[PDB]
Amino acid sequence: AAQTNAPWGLARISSTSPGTSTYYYDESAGQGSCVYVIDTGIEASHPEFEGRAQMVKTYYYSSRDGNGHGTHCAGTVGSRTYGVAKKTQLFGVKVLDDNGSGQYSTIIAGMDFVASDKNNRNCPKGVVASLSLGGGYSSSVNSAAARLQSSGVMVAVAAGNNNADARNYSPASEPSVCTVGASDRYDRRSSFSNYGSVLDIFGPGTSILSTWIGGSTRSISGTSMATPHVAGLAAYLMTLGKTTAASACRYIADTANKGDLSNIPFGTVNLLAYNNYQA
C-alpha cells in the first residue's frame, strides 16, 4: 500500500533517500501485533486510533492522557494517518503523570506489568513495547527493561535528548533493548539526540507529526518520537514474519539504511530504520 502526503518520518522509513512524502508499506500493517505504549497514557477515543487503542494500566488517579506525550507516541506507532503499523493494537500504560514525570519505581512497575499483561492478550504476531521516556542511569531501570525484553517483548527505548552519550541514561543504556536515536528530515542527527555505542538504530525524531490529546495533532521533536517509529516498524516486521521480538532490533539494524545520516559521532551506529518494502 501507499500513504500519500505522509508525515516525513513515515515516508523516510519506507525510502532509501530523504525528502519524499509517500509512505510505502505492506497492507498487513502490523495486524495481529500489539504495542504497549509506556508513557503518559493514550487518548484511546482519538479517531486516528480507530478503536485499536486502549488503556490497560495507570499508576495515577486517572488513566486519561492529560499530557499528550503518550497519545502522540501511540499515534506514531499505529495511528491511521501518522502510524507506522496502521493495524496494530495499542495498549496504554500510564507510568508518567500529566506533567510527563514519573518515579523510577513507577516506571519499573509499568515494565513488569507489560511482561505479564501480554499473556492475557491475543497478539499472535508478537508484542512490542515503546518507551518514550528516560532519566539518569539506573541499574534497576535498566534491569526492568531487560526483563521486559527477555519475557518476549520487543523493547524500544529513547536514547534521550541530552546531546550526550546515552550510556549515562536509563533505560537507554540497557544493552539488550533497542535504544533509538533521533534524526531530522535532512538525515542529520537531531540536535538534541543522544548517541554512543549503546545506540542500536536511528528513527525520525525531529518535528514529528502525530496525534495529540483533545482529538488534535501536533509536531514534536525528541528521541521520544523516534522510538515509536522503530516500535511500529518492529510490529510491522513481526506481522510479516520477517523477524521475532528477540531479533527485531538486530533485524531492523541489519536491514537499515546504512551511512545516510550526518553528524553521527564516531562509535555511534549510522543506521536509519527502513522497512525495505517492495511493491
From Swiss-Prot:
GO terms for molecular function: metal ion binding; serine-type endopeptidase activity. This is Proteinase K. One of its GO terms (cellular component) is extracellular region. Belongs to the peptidase S8 family. Ca(2+) 2 binds at residues 16, 260. It catalyses: Hydrolysis of keratin, and of other proteins with subtilisin-like specificity. Hydrolyzes peptide amides. Residues 7-279 form the Peptidase S8 domain. The chain holds residues 106 to 384 of 384 of the full protein. It is an enzyme of class 3 (hydrolase).
